Structure 1
Amino acid sequence: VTLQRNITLLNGVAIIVGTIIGSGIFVTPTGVLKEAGSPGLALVVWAACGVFSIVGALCYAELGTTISKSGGDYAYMLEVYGSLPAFLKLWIELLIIRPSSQYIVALVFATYLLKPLFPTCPVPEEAAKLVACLCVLLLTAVNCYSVKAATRVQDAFAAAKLLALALIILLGFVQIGKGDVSNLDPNFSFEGTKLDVGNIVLALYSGLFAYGGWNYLNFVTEEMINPYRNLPLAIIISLPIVTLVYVLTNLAYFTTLSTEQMLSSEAVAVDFGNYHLGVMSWIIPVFVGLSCFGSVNGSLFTSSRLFFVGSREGHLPSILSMIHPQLLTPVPSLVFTCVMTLLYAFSKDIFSVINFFSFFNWLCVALAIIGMIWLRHRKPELERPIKVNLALPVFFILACLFLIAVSFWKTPVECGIGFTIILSGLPVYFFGVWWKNKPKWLLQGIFSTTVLCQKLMQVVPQET
């Protein structure tokens, strides 16, 4: 009993597209224009961010084709840097990052779904929390039932969000083709090079939030059909399409709303729909919520698989990484992920942990690519069907180092708090993983708990 290989190229493309296209494209442009000033500067920032993301996606595609095992961005560190850094990353990932991200996406979905009912007065939180919890529970139940259903849902919602973006593109083209625009040929008016790079890089930073999630396919490798060919092809198909769609969407946004209207807006898509439709203007927010819905699925699935891998190496209790003999799904991992995600509904400052951990992704990516180069240097005997030309990873590493330096520059105090939280993961490693000769009264308790969970869920250990 193992996890069947039932993810095709189309499913991988859908996963990447649905993960990347979330809610960033509907909110971030306000911040990008605020930190850039001129529309042309914003457009060039978005193009540069797209190129940077394409470079990183190619690097990760080659790396994941070299090491074909699930739990990516964590298995690479486990193989290269050893066990302790891998556990240090995994503890933070399962403790703060994943549940907070999933809950934030669920809250965005809940708030944008209910927006037409309360167009001006804010949506009550006591209902948004319930809607988010219902979404999380329904998606985790769907994932627990079967794997094919999750892929079908992801495909449908990726198609839905692509259709919404296409609708925005057509609306922008209709607006621009009917006559005067006066917002595109004077594009460098108010070209703010404020503090020169001292602000320009910050603009780039904002764009990066819209280009996040291209590495979530590596989480679900060794579950694809012929990964050696499909893994790079999916990324190659996905990334340029996303970049082009983002650029066209920004152009359509600029063809309708003035600069002062944009900087005074909290949701550019809502204003665009209000202007261009008037009646049936609720279409634009609803789709946005639907988009977030898909994102939640695209998270939970991957998250579960990560924890699955986390239990195969002994870094997590053995109850995880156990498969239902009939459904062939990791029920305990999904249940644990859902419980951890729902546990964050009591946090009234959920929008701060993201600020606490903003350098953690770039550091992990840089470490993974450094391990890529070191593994290429020391072990020139592995199979590499794809081999990116050198001097590309070193430039990406330099960019990641500059990015983490910028992240420290922006907000140092909670970056230090994040360092402390990360360092807090050593005692748990030394107690659970390092300490083998445990007292006899603890092994029996753990065994009884695992047996009870097995009997409740009807899950068997993985056999190869």
Structure 2
Amino acid sequence: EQVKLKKEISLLNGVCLIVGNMIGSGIFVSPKGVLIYSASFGLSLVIWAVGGLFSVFGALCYAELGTTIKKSGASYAYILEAFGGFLAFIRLWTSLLIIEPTSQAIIAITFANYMVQPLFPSCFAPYAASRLLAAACICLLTFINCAYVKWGTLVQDIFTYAKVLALIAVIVAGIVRLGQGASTHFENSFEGSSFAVGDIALALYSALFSYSGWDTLNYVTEEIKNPERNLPLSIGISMPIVTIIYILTNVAYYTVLDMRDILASDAVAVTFADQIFGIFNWIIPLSVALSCFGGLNASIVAASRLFFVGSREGHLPDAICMIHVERFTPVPSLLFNGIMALIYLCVEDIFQLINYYSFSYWFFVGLSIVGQLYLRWKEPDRPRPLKLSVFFPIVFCLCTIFLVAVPLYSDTINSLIGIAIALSGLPFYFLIIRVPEHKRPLYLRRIVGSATRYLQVLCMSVAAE
């Protein structure tokens, strides 16, 4: 045949990618970010609905963008199309240095924690055991995605089914508790509600942070069986599912747990399970583990394809595209991503890094949408299969301006450190990537070419063609 990443993604695989990467484990463990800043059950539910609506706006923007540009790499390929080079290398680098390795490593550590949780419910799980299970999970998922692409989509589908079945168990338990008559929590809700622009803005911020997995399928979009039809349809099938699941899962939590017994909880779903299931309360930490497995597989697929496209341009070394000659899977990109994710596992406290890259993440999303608006102004008659109204790009541009202005006045020093990360990768751009390949150092090209030729047959990868 021809060495090239085949399509090998259906509509169901796309819905499962988006849903498994958007749900994750922040609805089982910490769904109390909206409830802290909105002191009511009713107001927190309304803010969940409003955040879901604004995330639907952003996801419609990204469906339009993905059918317009049609290149893998969610915001990298959309900053590279409207803007170029600069601001696309920075985002790619940001994702390479901090965003993707931290995200993955944290998902792996959470998987390990909630795998060993049923036998460590009160005490702390060991640090070495958590890190070794996280490393084993990252290695297994990187290998499964290095073997075949259909294996990666299959694992994603299985563990997304597991996610939604656990969340449907939670939702059904909550709705049954409501139906027996013991509501007593929505009896007089909207009572302690805090109505202040600060606390409502922070609740909206937490809600919009909860839905952060709709650009997933925009990373693997050269690998969809019919992108012009399976990107918008997959996104518009996955947004209602995740929104309704979030709202109904919070309804279940609020039905069973009172506020006290829900803000002092280290893992809400777990408490919910301990309080309603009795024994078989271990189903929920196991389900958080399976949820993190699915989310980590989605993260690995997305990051591997982002680095594939990064090196397909002049940004990363052109030994990262390098599709496998007989499996048609990006082996060097997946290996590089897994190595970078296993390096961050050695960091003891790895959530300060979340605090480092929050602002940069939402800045790059907003810059992708601004690039969409620019591509609507410049080059208007460029082929657009989905030409949505200019209302969704504008509304989510404002919403991401808000999501980026919150961390720039709340924790202004961590956002500056994230900016430092990006423009600290910048010195690789003005001396290696900006210079033509023929005048850059002869010996450095020699070394890189030899290393590439020695991880070529090793990865059994001949890149494109």
TM-score w.r.t. length of structure 1: 0.97
SS of equivalent residue, structure 1 residue 70: coil
- Bigger drift between 304-313 and 355-364 goes to 355-364
**1:31-430 aligned within 5 A:** 31-193=33-195, 196-430=196-430
SS of equivalent residue, structure 2 residue 448: helix
- Opposite residue 411 of structure 1, the aligned amino acid is D
- After superposition, what is the alpha-carbon deviation per residue over 1:316-335, rounded to whole angstroms, capped at 9, x for unaligned? 11111012211111111111
1:28, 1:210 within 8 Å by CA — same for their partners in 2? no
2:57, 2:395 within 8 Å by CA — same for their partners in 1? no
**What is the aligned length?**
461
2:15, 2:235 within 8 Å by CA — same for their partners in 1? yes
SS of equivalent residue, structure 1 residue 204: helix
- After superposition, what is the alpha-carbon deviation per residue over 1:298-355, rounded to whole angstroms, capped at 9, x for unaligned? 1101111111111111111111101221111111111101100000121112110111
2:308, 2:320 within 8 Å by CA — same for their partners in 1? yes
2:4, 2:463 within 8 Å by CA — same for their partners in 1? no
TM-score w.r.t. length of structure 2: 0.97
In the TM superposition, residue 145 of structure 1 has moved relative to its aligned partner by 0.7
- After superposition, what is the alpha-carbon deviation per residue over 1:176-198, rounded to whole angstroms, capped at 9, x for unaligned? 222232111210121222xx111
Aligned residue in 1 for 2:10 = 8
- Bigger drift between 401-410 and 293-302 goes to 401-410
* Separation in 1, partners of 2:13, 2:458: 32
* Separation in 2, partners of 1:440, 1:92: 28
SS of equivalent residue, structure 2 residue 383: coil
SS of equivalent residue, structure 2 residue 182: coil
1:65, 1:385 within 8 Å by CA — same for their partners in 2? yes
Question: For residues 439 and 152 of structure 1, do their structure 2 counterparts lie closer, same or farther at Cα, with a shift above 3 Å needed?
Answer: closer
* Separation in 1, partners of 2:275, 2:103: 32
* Separation in 2, partners of 1:110, 1:181: 35
* Separation in 1, partners of 2:12, 2:28: 25
Question: For residues 258 and 461 of structure 1, do their structure 2 counterparts lie closer, same or farther at Cα, with a shift above 3 Å needed?
Answer: closer
* Separation in 2, partners of 1:232, 1:168: 29
* Separation in 2, partners of 1:147, 1:354: 29
In the TM superposition, residue 413 of structure 1 has moved relative to its aligned partner by 1.2
- Opposite residue 46 of structure 2, the aligned amino acid is V
* Separation in 2, partners of 1:402, 1:294: 30
In the TM superposition, residue 440 of structure 1 has moved relative to its aligned partner by 2.4
- After superposition, what is the alpha-carbon deviation per residue over 1:374-426, rounded to whole angstroms, capped at 9, x for unaligned? 21222123111211112332122122112211121111111112222222122
In the TM superposition, residue 29 of structure 1 has moved relative to its aligned partner by 2.4
- Opposite residue 39 of structure 1, the aligned amino acid is F
2:72, 2:219 within 8 Å by CA — same for their partners in 1? yes
- Bigger drift between 175-184 and 225-234 goes to 175-184
* Separation in 2, partners of 1:264, 1:369: 37
1:143, 1:150 within 8 Å by CA — same for their partners in 2? yes
- Opposite residue 156 of structure 2, the aligned amino acid is Q
- Opposite residue 461 of structure 1, the aligned amino acid is A
* Separation in 2, partners of 1:389, 1:417: 36
2:432, 2:440 within 8 Å by CA — same for their partners in 1? no
In the TM superposition, residue 249 of structure 1 has moved relative to its aligned partner by 0.8
Aligned residue in 1 for 2:448 = 446
- Opposite residue 25 of structure 1, the aligned amino acid is I
Aligned residue in 2 for 1:20 = 22
In the TM superposition, residue 209 of structure 1 has moved relative to its aligned partner by 2.6
* Separation in 1, partners of 2:426, 2:4: 32
CA RMSD of aligned residues (A): 1.2
1:169, 1:249 within 8 Å by CA — same for their partners in 2? yes
- Opposite residue 334 of structure 1, the aligned amino acid is L
1:311, 1:317 within 8 Å by CA — same for their partners in 2? yes
* Separation in 1, partners of 2:265, 2:137: 28
Aligned residue in 2 for 1:456 = 458
- Opposite residue 52 of structure 1, the aligned amino acid is F
* Separation in 2, partners of 1:296, 1:274: 26
1:30, 1:266 within 8 Å by CA — same for their partners in 2? no
SS of equivalent residue, structure 1 residue 24: coil
- Bigger drift between 415-424 and 98-107 goes to 415-424
2:360, 2:419 within 8 Å by CA — same for their partners in 1? no
In the TM superposition, residue 240 of structure 1 has moved relative to its aligned partner by 1.0
| Unaligned residue ranges in structure 2 (runs of 5+) | none
In the TM superposition, residue 108 of structure 1 has moved relative to its aligned partner by 0.5
In the TM superposition, residue 116 of structure 1 has moved relative to its aligned partner by 0.7
- Opposite residue 257 of structure 2, the aligned amino acid is L
* Separation in 2, partners of 1:288, 1:270: 9
2:54, 2:208 within 8 Å by CA — same for their partners in 1? no
In the TM superposition, residue 367 of structure 1 has moved relative to its aligned partner by 1.5
* Separation in 2, partners of 1:21, 1:395: 23
* Separation in 2, partners of 1:443, 1:33: 55
- Bigger drift between 422-431 and 242-251 goes to 422-431
* Separation in 2, partners of 1:141, 1:239: 30
Question: For residues 94 and 285 of structure 1, do their structure 2 counterparts lie closer, same or farther at Cα, with a shift above 3 Å needed?
Answer: same
- Opposite residue 68 of structure 1, the aligned amino acid is K
- Bigger drift between 432-441 and 292-301 goes to 432-441
| Unaligned residue ranges in structure 1 (runs of 5+) | none
